[PDB]
Design a protein around this ligand. Structure first.
Ligand SMILES: Nc1ncnc2c1ncn2[C@@H]1O[C@H](COP(=O)(O)OP(=O)(O)O)[C@@H](O)[C@H]1O
Ligand SMILES: [Ca+2]
Lengths: 464, 68, 375, 68
């Protein structure tokens, strides 16, 4: 792009260095480890390249989607969660740790106990920490800005300790969730500086009245541990997702320019097709993108391009055109489709995993390009699992946690709490309302994520 | 004097509204807890009988085991 | 929000209407079901009266409104009013057109066949609704937890329903329909208050009873022991200075009316307490089905928020019934919207296509299309 | 008008004290009941643990009886 676009300006090739060093910069914070790759980026990224009057670029925006958020609570043995949680420990001075109410022992917490692993044989964060710090100050993230960011995790680490001892309080109805060790739930609100009591009474418990005004929140709805843990995490993830995307934009505050507005050259970069000898739900979302990626090419290198041939009026004849596989798209979009049958089950909470399975085998295993044990008599497939044929090979999936991990449903009860808090960051993590996503707010996230992927396809069709 | 009294009356009613509001929320909180207290009391009594029954039946089973 | 037709969510009863935007979790607008006239002459020119007054508009100013009840269990004295009641919901608040989005409604079990068609006629013929459906109250409150084996008891203002819907629906009789909910409670209190002199006559103050009820009134645990307690003036005499200006010490009046629930003998009927009807729905089904029914009993409806409604069930059920399994009643905390939670689901289901009705489907099989094919 | 203002000041200042007084008493009554509620809740949970054990011991005795 450079040179071709360009040169003279001493403030061009010099600032180009810090921009080229922006790649390894963001690969030390948001990235984590995978068995297929070490430098695994953990955030969608559709970069955009603008230009200056002199020739050099001026800046660009960044956009992500979904964000993997099931690794914080569950993962395979040997693997490791996000880097920030481990690299931060083996580095900061013990004095800095105690200030955050921390002790040099992962098992003591919950955020690091949900896995069962702590020490990795290959990684030595104690030494690697000096590489991340060199990236902290060099760019422009002073300790002041660092502590600010840590105040978010400092809270989360104070909220994370909130565990529960299956409370069978209700004589009959439904087992509630009791917190005897309140100092964890107290410290949780201490950072937010909100009423410890009301908080627990307004979140763990749902409430609504209504009458032209806007209700009086207090009525109680204690729910099971799964839904309680679901709500707990649901917030813990989205809270950090919005921040990171708003952080990278503030990283550009001392990089991005606002002098010209013109053409935009985009660059795509999303999670890669990972392959294990044992897949699950979290794999589906990633593998699903590839199904859309293959559709992209066939739409481009086989459709939009062939139509350009005849538009020029040059010799061309339809040579053996293999299936356009729009079935793999209709099988999970319009009514009577996978995710249309899946997300529908996510709401039917009484349809767990075994009942949900039966809603797939019957709906499909007849439509072309999808197998299982029943139809395809193969012992490799379990009675609870199925055989999904991609445009490549074969993959079998489990069922552990399907629902709570897939639902994603995030109502406006966990979100509104932080918004009404008193802190320059807590409300700051929720930036100026409606950034490229407005329409209407109150609605399950099951549809919100569906819009995220649709915002990726529609914008790729009509272009070059 | 009327102007001064009106000024004092304005702030007086404001404090009165705040006081009544605090009392309204306090009397309600005391009530809901009182109901829960009685709800737990009944649960404690009905289980107190089950606990005894669970102990006696265990002792009876032991005596029954000693005989055989 | 924008893409895809996006369907609304609604739940109309015979007392309170529940409706909001689309893809929501809970009702956004819950206006009262009232529509009367100005028996008086409106100022007649200080607007061409008409509008019997409705919504927060009527409820705000009852005074000069002869609240006329249109929907009384089954029979609708007049349909003409219902037309302009629905013309307010979708537009004045939601600001969205039904001639664009589907629609979901609730079905009052055992409702005249002619009614389900009369309603649909208003949609298909005038409000042009190519897609809609009318689901069954209780069954919705179900599909929202984590099991396929529970008995449900859903009710509010309409009529009581003891529906043991867990594994399936409809077999011998099991299910029950009892005209004794909400409106019935509001009507009974005024009659009993006459013993003390208090007589809330007109239908306007009749509503005030319902308003006052849901703030202090509670259910008698045991009327026998509570009667002797009347000697004391602490747990009885309750304070509620009428917003008008006359205190009503509702002491023995609070736990007197609810007694009718367990004793329908006080309302001229042979129906037994709700704990007998429980047996009536259990004794019919198979023998090896009970042990797990007691382990799960769903109690939906905001009516079941009266202090002393759940603790009584454990006392009467464990009495005249098998007692070697886990007696357990699931009474959802906020169980009033349990139907609304399930409603948002059906409207988003895709299998829903197998059940719902399409524009053309209504003309091919005639008006009966609905309950002639489904159940 | 001054007489009316002073009259309203008297009944307001008095009712203000009563409202505040009731707020304290209501909170006072809330506290004593809350404490007892917590004590009961704890005592009840402990009995449930003993209730389970008592049953398991009773059942174990029955199973031990069948063997003999
Ligand atoms: N907080 C409450 N406590 C007890 N009863 C309540 C409460 N809020 C509402 N109700 C009652 O619930 C009933 C309305 O419930 P609803 O589910 O809307 O009934 P329906 O759908 O049969 O019209 C009314 O009798 C009302 O007084
Ligand atoms: Ca009802």
């Amino acid at each position: 792009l450079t040179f071709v676009s360009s040169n003279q300006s001493p403030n061009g090739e010099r600032i180009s260095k810090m921009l080229l060093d922006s790649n390894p910069l963001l690969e030390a914070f948001g990235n984590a480890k995978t068995l297929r790759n070490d430098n695994s980026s953990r955030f969608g990224k559709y970069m955009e390249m603008q230009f200056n009057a002199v020739g050099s670029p001026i800046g660009g925006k960044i956009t992500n989607y979904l964000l993997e958020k099931s690794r914080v609570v569950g993962r395979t043995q040997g693997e490791r969660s996000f880097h920030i949680f481990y690299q931060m420990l083996k580095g900061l001075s013990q004095s800095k740790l105690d200030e955050l109410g921390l002790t040099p022992n992962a098992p003591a917490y919950e955020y690091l106990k949900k896995s069962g692993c702590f020490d990795v044989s290959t990684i030595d964060d104690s030494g690697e920490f000096k590489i991340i710090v060199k990236a902290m100050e060099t760019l422009g993230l002073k300790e002041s800005d660092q502590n600010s960011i840590w105040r978010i995790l400092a809270a989360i680490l104070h909220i994370g300790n909130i565990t529960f001892a299956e409370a069978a309080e209700q004589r009959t109805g439904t087992t509630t969730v009791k917190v005897s060790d309140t100092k964890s739930l107290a410290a949780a609100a201490s950072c937010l500086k909100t009423d410890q009591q009301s908080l627990s009474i307004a979140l763990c418990y749902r409430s609504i009245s209504t009458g032209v005004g806007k209700r009086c929140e207090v009525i109680s709805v204690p729910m099971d541990c799964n839904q309680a843990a679901y709500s707990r995490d649901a917030l813990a993830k989205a809270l950090y997702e919005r921040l990171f995307n708003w952080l990278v934009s503030k990283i550009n505050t001392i990089i991005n320019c606002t002098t010209e507005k013109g053409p935009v050259i985009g660059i795509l970069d999303i999670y890669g097709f990972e392959v294990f000898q044992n897949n699950s739900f979290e794999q589906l979302n990633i593998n699903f993108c590839n199904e859309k990626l293959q559709q992209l090419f066939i739409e481009l290198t086989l459709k939009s391009e062939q139509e350009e041939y005849v538009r020029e009026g040059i010799e061309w004849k339809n040579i053996e055109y293999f299936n356009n596989k729009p079935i793999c798209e209709l099988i999970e979009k319009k009514p009577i489709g996978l995710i249309s049958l899946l997300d529908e089950a996510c709401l039917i909470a009484k349809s767990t995993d075994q009942t949900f399975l039966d809603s797939i085998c019957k709906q499909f295993e007849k439509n072309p390009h999808l197998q299982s044990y029943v139809v395809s008599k193969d012992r490799s497939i379990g009675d609870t699992c199925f055989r999904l044929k991609h445009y490549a090979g074969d993959v079998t999936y489990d069922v552990r946690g399907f629902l709570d991990k897939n639902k994603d449903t995030l109502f406006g009860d966990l979100i509104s709490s932080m918004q009404s808090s008193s802190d320059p960051l807590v409300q700051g993590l929720f930036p100026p309302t409606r950034p490229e996503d407005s329409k209407k707010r109150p609605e399950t996230a099951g549809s919100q994520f569906r819009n995220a992927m649709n915002a990726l396809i529609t914008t790729l069709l009509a272009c070059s | 004097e009327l102007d001064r009294a009106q000024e004092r009356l304005a702030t007086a009613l404001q404090k009165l509204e705040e006081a009544e509001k605090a009392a309204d929320e306090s009397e309600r909180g005391m009530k809901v807890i009182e109901s829960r207290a009685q709800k737990d009391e009944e649960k404690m009594e009905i289980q107190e009988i089950q606990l005894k029954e669970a102990k006696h039946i265990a002792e009876d089973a032991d005596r029954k085991y000693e005989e055989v | 929000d924008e893409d895809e037709t996006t369907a609304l969510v609604c739940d109309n009863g015979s007392g309170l209407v529940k409706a909001g935007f689309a893809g929501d979790d809970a009702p956004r607008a819950v206006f009262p079901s009232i529509v009367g006239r100005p028996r008086h002459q409106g100022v007649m020119v200080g607007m061409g009266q008409k509008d019997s007054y409705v919504g927060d508009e009527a409820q705000s100013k009852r005074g000069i409104l002869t609240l006329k009840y249109p929907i009384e269990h089954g029979i609708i004295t007049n349909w003409d009013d219902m037309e302009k009641i629905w013309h307010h919901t979708f537009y004045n608040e939601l600001r969205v057109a039904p001639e664009e989005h589907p629609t979901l409604l609730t079905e009052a079990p055992l409702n005249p066949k002619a009614n389900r068609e009369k309603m649909t006629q208003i949609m298909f013929e005038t409000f042009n609704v190519p897609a809609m459906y009318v689901a069954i109250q209780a069954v919705l409150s179900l599909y929202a937890s984590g099991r396929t084996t529970g008995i449900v008891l859903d009710s509010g203002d309409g009529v009581t329903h003891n529906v043991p819907i867990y594994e399936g629906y409809a077999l011998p009789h099991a299910i029950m329909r009892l005209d004794l909910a909400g409106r019935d409670l509001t009507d009974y209190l005024m009659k009993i208050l006459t013993e003390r002199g208090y007589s809330f006559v007109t239908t306007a103050e009749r509503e005030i009873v319902r308003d006052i009820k849901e703030k202090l009134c509670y259910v008698a645990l045991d009327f026998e022991n509570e009667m002797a307690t009347a000697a004391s003036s602490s747990s009885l005499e309750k304070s509620y200075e009428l917003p008008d200006g006359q205190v009503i010490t509702i002491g023995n009046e609070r736990f007197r009316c609810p007694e009718t629930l367990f004793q329908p003998s006080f309302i001229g009927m042979e129906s037994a307490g709700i704990h007998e009807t429980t047996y009536n729905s259990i004794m019919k089904c198979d023998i090896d089905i009970r042990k797990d029914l007691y382990a799960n009993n769903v109690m939906s409806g905001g009516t079941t928020m009266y202090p002393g409604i759940a603790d009584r069930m454990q006392k009467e059920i464990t009495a005249l019934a098998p007692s070697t399994m886990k007696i357990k009643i699931i009474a959802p905390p906020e169980r009033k919207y349990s139907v609304w939670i399930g409603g948002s689901i059906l409207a988003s289901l895709s299998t829903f296509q197998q059940m719902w009705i399409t524009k053309q489907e209504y003309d091919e099989a005639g008006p009966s299309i609905v309950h002639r094919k489904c159940f």
